[PDB]
Structure formats: structure tokens, C-alpha cells
Ligand binder design. Structure first.
Ligand code: NDP
Ligand code: NDP
Length: 747
């Protein structure tokens, strides 16, 4: 039994194949000319009144969402469509092409945006297996990509694709690896450093002495959970960073050891700052250079923050002394530092002009007017054009080389100029050479010093909680996959901040909650957690709770292995009851993990499915997972159990597979946003259940009493007879052969 991962290789679409009849199922006009019917019904009408079955109907899906209701509407809608379609049967040899936007993660940079659409994928996948060569799934992030590609989409016979500008992608299961990604020393307190600089291959995770022991000064030791990656980190990795640097500066985590020389904050504390050599389970730094963590921030959203905002602050306050009314020019706007400055600048009451690449513009919250491409030098006369020089009072430049020159001709009036880039660094007096009026400082944030950083840290937080700065968009990765992340980073595909997360680790002190801890899997996992693993505080949770056979025994067993076990009756889909449960977890064993193993089953081809059945199967998986993530503390690890059925589209379980595909998508999106989430797509288990096991046993016991099972027809004729019949107590049974075992059975 392998573990599998679903990949999306590029495929080649046949470029010379015949373009086919097409109708559009949609609200509105088509820029192109192709038949449009607002709904399936109307396309029937045309068929009714003579029209010839189109080879392909396109059904672009209305935008979903990641909320229960969303999932509900957009699978229900998919069902009406699938059912309407199957029942016509003039629409045979014709194919329904359902289009989605962002239901599917294909490229490294990109997360699932529409969970509900991802549910759609599962359901339809099921139906595809039920009816081959009749439906086609297409994820296309911006439509009209579609039509050009359309004769190819159809000729390749492939039922599932995602269109990206890169290419067309098909999905397939793959073994883990394939190289096996990044391997860990397991001996805790390693780190990521570039071993063979020059190339991203030859990154590795090798044990680090420095982190482990001992403190300190001065110093405080941290159990890291996430860390920010900076552009710096990507150059270091490529033997292309002009200066001294150790991979990974900044992060957030939990305090382990403190002292000597430290009083302000103490162990257990959640903390973020500018840690050196950040990319490991264990690192240690100066307690003034780090600070405790605001709102209910995730460790991930904490880790993105420090470097970018310290720079922005240290740069715009200390070095620039930016005043209200004064205006600013910032490069790499949709980047972290670029992103940060514009936020802080708007607080400091400046006008702002800035630059990123055209594809990132939407992510800037700046009036069209003030924007410009960042890999050209056009901005100059457009901005100087935009405002008569004097142009900008201050410049926070990252673009070095010759892009840095067109910069300084902004702000001719005079003013201050800040350089970030070490390659082609300059001289202040020799800068005064080129332009009059302009002072010039080339800085590193660490320059401010521990004293100043801690003071800027305390001052930034204030702003964050004042709701005046908001942490950047996070796109997260697991340290073991850093190469994929740094490649992204160095290719400048991203917006906002990238972040690395450390391998998840449950507080051995803490509580673990298993939903559906009665079920075939939940019990086993429940047992394995207590009997083999650390776990010594359990909450189990199922609709019936302790009242279902044999849950009393199930508990006994564990509590007997010396554990603090609670089994509460609770429907996970009732947020009000879940809350009641979580709250009753004791303060000293606070929960660190959820195993969402709760589930309800259905069976039937998509023809036969109904809305009411759909919701049956959705309620524990979707509402439950939503309730959980809503209620759960951010950095509680969440393990969702889906089913391989959601991935193969097992058929017979359309609607179940929808639920499971949601879970798969919820994790993929959620880990991306930084939070500790993992989703396992179980194939079949041998196990059975307390259930079940107990029903089976009853059957043995009754047999072992030389009894035999009654057919249902006979059982009901007896029901009939015994109900209205003279004897008040009556044993309708079928015996076997002609029992010295039972005294009652004599004569
Ligand atoms: N000295 C110090 O203390 C610090 C220095 N820095 C420096 O500031 C810069 C910004 O850092 P950070 O915000 O973390 O990283 P960013 O997220 O800002 O990434 C850099 C961005 O610059 C843009 N860019 C412009 N020209 C190019 C190019 N030719 N190739 C690739 N990208 C380009 C890219 O986006 P776009 O498509 O919009 O151009 C890219 O996203 C880094 O280079 C870093 O070295 C950062 C922090 C501290
Ligand atoms: N076992 C297998 O062969 C496979 C399992 N899986 C995955 O494993 C999971 C478990 O399968 P299995 O253990 O056999 O399922 P079971 O039906 O045997 O157990 C399901 C458990 O979930 C509980 N439950 C159902 N709905 C709720 C609810 N709304 N609130 C609280 N508890 C609820 C049920 O308790 P009660 O009804 O008493 O409330 C029961 O305890 C499945 O959901 C699926 O994700 C995937 C493929 C195959």
C-alpha cells in the first residue's frame, strides 16, 4: 500500500481536429457567435422543434464559494443538470462540458479558490465513471481561453482538464516522491541551509548545533512553526547573494527556554520576530528582536509580517522621516516590502506612486492613475507627466542595475533615496554627483539594532491591532518542500509573502478530538492514539455518543489504558453543540489536533440521486468541517478524512464523492493560507465496526442456538399474524435440525 499524490502533468491537445456544434448554457450575450440558451430546458425545446443535437453543450458554472450553502447550491445545480441531460437521450453522443474557475490546484503558486466548484468536480467525476464519454470537466481561470482550445479539449478524449496559459493539464495519481522531496534527520533541531549553492537542487535539511543548546544572554529559544521566506533567501540559495547571510530570517513560534538576562516575556509565549536561520523546528534569537503575537493570528500569518514591515517602518520613519502630504515612489508593489510600504505610507498620510508587473495590478489597492509597470522605465515621464516635477519626495527602491537610474530622475526637486539591493550598491557622495539635492542611504534593517527593532516591533503591532496595517497575503509550503517554494519565489510568480511551515506536531500534553470516534476507522484511530502514541487526553464525538453499542466498552478500554477519555453525543454539524463540547475541554490539556472521521454514506447512480440525499451526505463532512475550522483555534492541526472515491470518482457515490472532494479541496486551500491542515483520501479498509461487529456476533449467537435467519416475507407474515393474535407473547423463529443444549427445547 503506497501513499499517493495527485499531479497535473501538461498534455498536448490535438491542434488539427474538427470544430463541433456548440451551444452555450448561460445568462448572457457571447462576444463570439455561438448558440445561447439560458437553461437546459430551452435546449430541449429546440431539439423538440426540429433542431439537431449539438456535439457539445458548454455549461459554465455560476461562481460558488467555500461556504456550506455554496457547496449545497452548486452541487444541487450540478445534479439537476446531470439528470436533465441523461434523460433526454437525443443528447447522446453529445457531451456536457462543465466549466469551472479555480476548483483545482495545478501550478505551485496556485490554491483552490472555489471549494464548492471542487465539490462539483467530485460529483461529476463519479458520474463520468457511470457514463463514459458524455461529460467533460474543464477548469479555466479566465474564460475565452476555452473556445480557442475547444477543438483540442474534445479531440484528446480526456475527461478532466484545467486550462492554464502554461498549457492544458490533466490530472493523474502519482506515487510519493517521485524523488521523495526533502528528507529530515529526524534528530530534532535541524535547519534548511543551501549546501550546494548555485542551484535549487542541492538544498537540504542538515542538523544544526547552534539552535539546540544552550542559552543565552540575551537569548531565548523557540519552537518554530512557520517562517517567512524573503527574496534574500532565494539568492543565498543560488550563490548569488553579494553578502553574508544564513537561510531564513524571521518566523513565529513558541518559547521553550529563556534566560539569563531576559524578563519581558516568558516560556509558552507565542512569539514572532527576526529569527536567524529560521527554517528549522528549533532556532534561538535575541528577545528584543522578537515580540508576542497579536489578535488571534496564525503562526503562519505572524511569520509573513516582520521583515517586510520592519523594513517599511525603519525605512519610511527613521531613515526617510516621511511627512504627511509628502509623496512616495515604491518598487515591487505587490511584493512584501512593496506591499508593506504602501500600507504604512497611507497611514503616514502620503500620496503614493508605485510599480509591479501588469498581472499583479489588481492586488495593489491604488488608484489606476498612480500605477506603472515595474520591468520598464516608462513610469518616469508618465509620473513626471502625472505630476509636474518635483515628482516624488522619497524613494524606496529595490530595482537595482539600470532600472535604479530612471528612479532618481524622479524627485528632481530634491529629497531622500533608499536602496535595498546589494548588487550594484552605490556611494552617497558619488550619488550627489549624479543629481543635486538628493541624499542617499543604502540600508539593511538589522542595522537599526536589537534596541531599535524591538521598539519598531512594539510600534508596528500597535498599528496592526489599531486595524491600520494588515498582514500580507500568505502562500504557504512545508519546509520539506522548500525547493518548490524558492523556485516560485525566485521566478517572481507570487504576490504578497511566501512562508514555510514546520512539520505538524501535536502537544503531547494536549487534547485530541475525534469526530465519529465510534466508526470503523475512528475507534481504531482512537485506540491507536491512546495505546501506541502519546495521547492521554481524548474527546470522542458522534451523534449517538456513549449510547451506541459498544461505546461504553470502547471508552472503558481506553480510560483503562490510563487516559482521560470523554465520549460526548454531538452532531458536528450543529455548531452550537460543538461549541459546548470544545469549551468543556479542560484548560491544562488544551486541544492540539482534530481527526474529522465523521461521515454518512449513500449509494446510487446519479440518475437516482436526490437533493435530500445530497444533503444527508454533505451534512457531517461539510457543515462539520466548517463548524470545526470556525471554532478551532487556528494552529490546531486538522485532519480531514475524505475518500479516494472523491479522486477516482468511484461511481455509485456521486454525492458522497462531492463531500469528500470538498474536504480534499478545503485542506489544499487551507494549508496554502498557512494553517495546519491535512486531508487523507482513504481507500477501502478491512475493519468493519463496533456496529456491525456486534450485529454479526448476534447473528452467530442466535445460530449457535440452532436457529436460522428468517426471510423478510415470512418475517412480515408473522409480524402480521402475531400482532392480532390470541397469544400475548410469541416467539416467531425457524429452527434447524431435530438442542440438548437448551432445557426449554425438550419435547
Ligand atoms: N536590506 C534589507 O534589509 C532587506 C532587503 N530586501 C530586499 O528588498 C527586495 C524585496 O524583498 P521582498 O519584498 O522580500 O521580495 P518581493 O516579494 O518584493 O519580491 C521582489 C519583487 O520585485 C519584482 N521585480 C522587479 N524586477 C524584477 C526582476 N527583474 N526579476 C524578478 N523580480 C523583479 C518582482 O515582482 P514584480 O513582478 O512586481 O516586479 C518580485 O515579486 C528583495 O530583493 C530583498 O533583497 C528585503 C528586505 C530587507
Ligand atoms: N471505512 C472505509 O472503508 C472507508 C472510510 N473512508 C473514510 O473514513 C471515514 C469513516 O469511515 P467509517 O469509519 O467506516 O464510517 P462509519 O459509518 O463506520 O462511522 C462513521 C462515524 O461518524 C459518526 N457520525 C456520522 N455523522 C456524524 C455527525 N453528524 N456528527 C457526529 N458524528 C457523526 C457516526 O456516529 P453516529 O452515527 O453514532 O453519530 C460514526 O461514529 C469516512 O467518513 C470516510 O471519510 C473512506 C473510504 C473508505
Amino acid at each position: 500500500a503506497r501513499l499517493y499524490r495527485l499531479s497535473w502533468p501538461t498534455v498536448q491537445l490535438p491542434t488539427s481536429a474538427q470544430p463541433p456544434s456548440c451551444v452555450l448554457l448561460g445568462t448572457s450575450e457571447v462576444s463570439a457567435d455561438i448558440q445561447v440558451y439560458p437553461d437546459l430546458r430551452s435546449l430541449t425545446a429546440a431539439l423538440d422543434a426540429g433542431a439537431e443535437p449539438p456535439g457539445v453543450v458548454i455549461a459554465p458554472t455560476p461562481p460558488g464559494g467555500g461556504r456550506t450553502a455554496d457547496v449545497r447550491e452548486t452541487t444541487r445545480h450540478a445534479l439537476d443538470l446531470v439528470q436533465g441531460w441523461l434523460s433526454d437521450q437525443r443528447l447522446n453522443e453529445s457531451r456536457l462540458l462543465l466549466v469551472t474557475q479555480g476548483a483545482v490546484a495545478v501550478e505551485p503558486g496556485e490554491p483552490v479558490t472555489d471549494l464548492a466548484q471542487a465539490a462539483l468536480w467530485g460529483l461529476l467525476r463519479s458520474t463520468q465513471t457511470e457514463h463514459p464519454d458524455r461529460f467533460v470537466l474543464v477548469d479555466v481561470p479566465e474564460p475565452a481561453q476555452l473556445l480557442p482550445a475547444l477543438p483540442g479539449v474534445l479531440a484528446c478524449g480526456e475527461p478532466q482538464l484545467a486550462l492554464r496559459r502554461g498549457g492544458a493539464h490533466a490530472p493523474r495519481l502519482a506515487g510519493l516522491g517521485s524523488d521523495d522531496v526533502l528528507p529530515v534527520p529526524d534528530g530534532t533541531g535541524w535547519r534548511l541551509e543551501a549546501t550546494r549553492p548555485g542551484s535549487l537542487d542541492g538544498l537540504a535539511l542538515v542538523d544544526e548545533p547552534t539552535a539546540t543548546a544552550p542559552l543565552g544572554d540575551g537569548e531565548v529559544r523557540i519552537a518554530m512553526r512557520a517562517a517567512g521566506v524573503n527574496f534574500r533567501d532565494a539568492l543565498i540559495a543560488l550563490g548569488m547573494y553579494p553578502g553574508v547571510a544564513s537561510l531564513g530570517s524571521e518566523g513565529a513560534g513558541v518559547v521553550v527556554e529563556t534566560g539569563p538576562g531576559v524578563t519581558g516575556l516568558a516560556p509558552g509565549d507565542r512569539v514572532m520576530g527576526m529569527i536567524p536561520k529560521a527554517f528549522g523546528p528549533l532556532a534561538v534569537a535575541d528577545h528584543r528582536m522578537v515580540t508576542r503575537i497579536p489578535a488571534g493570528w496564525s503562526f503562519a500569518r505572524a511569520a509573513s509580517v516582520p521583515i517586510v514591515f520592519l523594513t517599511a517602518y525603519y525605512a519610511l520613519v527613521d531613515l526617510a522621516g516621511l511627512r504627511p502630504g509628502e509623496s512616495l515612489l515604491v518598487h515591487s508593489a505587490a511584493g512584501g516590502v512593496g506591499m508593506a510600504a504602501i500600507q504604512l505610507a497611507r497611514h503616514l498620510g502620503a500620496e503614493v506612486y508605485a510599480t509591479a508587473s501588469e498581472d499583479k495590478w489588481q492586488a495593489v489597492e491604488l488608484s489606476r492613475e498612480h500605477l506603472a509597470s515595474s520591468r520598464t522605465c516608462d513610469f518616469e515621464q508618465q509620473f513626471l507627466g502625472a505630476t509636474g516635477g518635483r515628482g516624488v519626495d522619497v524613494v524606496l527602491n529595490s530595482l537595482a542595475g539600470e532600472f535604479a537610474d530612471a528612479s532618481l530622475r524622479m524627485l528632481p526637486r530634491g529629497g531622500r533615496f533608499l536602496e535595498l539591493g546589494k548588487t550594484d550598491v552605490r556611494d552617497p557622495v558619488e550619488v550627489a554627483d549624479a543629481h543635486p539635492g538628493v541624499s542617499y542611504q543604502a540600508f539593511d534593517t538589522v542595522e537599526a539594532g536589537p534596541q531599535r527593532i524591538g521598539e519598531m516591533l512594539h510600534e508596528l503591532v500597535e498599528l496592526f491591532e489599531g486595524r491600520v496595517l494588515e498582514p500580507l497575503p500568505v502562500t504557504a509550503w512545508d519546509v520539506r518542500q522548500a525547493p518548490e517554494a524558492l523556485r516560485h519565489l525566485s521566478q517572481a510568480r507570487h504576490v504578497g509573502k511566501l512562508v514555510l511551515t514546520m512539520p505538524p506536531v501535536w502537544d503531547a500534553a494536549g487534547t485530541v478530538l475525534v469526530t465519529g470516534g465510534t466508526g470503523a476507522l475512528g475507534a481504531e484511530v482512537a485506540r491507536h492514539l491512546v495505546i501506541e502514541r502519546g495521547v492521554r487526553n481524548l474527546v470522542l464525538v458522534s451523534r449517538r455518543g456513549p449510547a451506541a453499542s459498544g461505546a461504553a466498552e470502547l471508552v472503558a478500554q481506553l480510560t483503562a489504558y490510563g487516559a482521560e477519555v470523554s465520549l460526548q453525543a454531538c452532531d458536528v454539524a450543529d455548531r452550537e453543540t460543538l461549541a459546548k463540547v470544545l469549551a468543556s475541554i479542560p484548560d491544562e490539556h488544551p486541544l492540539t489536533a482534530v481527526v474529522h472521521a465523521a461521515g454518512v454514506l449513500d449509494d446510487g447512480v446519479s440518475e437516482s440521486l436526490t437533493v435530500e440525499r445530497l444533503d444527508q451526505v454533505l451534512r457531517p463532512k461539510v457543515d462539520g468541517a466548517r463548524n470545526l475550522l470556525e471554532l478551532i483555534d487556528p494552529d490546531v492541526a486538522l485532519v480531514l478524512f475524505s475518500s479516494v472515491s472523491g479522486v477516482l470518482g468511484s461511481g455509485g457515490q456521486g454525492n458522497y464523492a462531492a463531500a469528500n472532494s470538498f474536504l480534499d479541496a478545503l485542506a489544499q486551500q487551507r494549508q496554502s493560507r498557512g494553517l495546519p491542515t491535512r486531508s487523507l483520501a482513504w481507500g477501502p479498509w478491512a475493519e468493519h465496526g463496533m456496529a456491525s461487529t456486534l450485529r454479526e456476533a448476534e447473528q452467530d449467537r442466535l445460530a449457535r442456538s440452532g436457529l436460522l435467519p428468517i426471510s423478510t416475507e415470512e418475517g412480515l407474515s408473522q409480524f402480521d399474524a402475531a400482532c392480532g393474535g390470541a397469544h400475548t407473547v410469541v416467539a416467531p423463529v425457524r429452527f434447524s435440525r431435530l438442542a440438548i443444549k437448551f432445557s426449554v427445547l425438550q419435547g
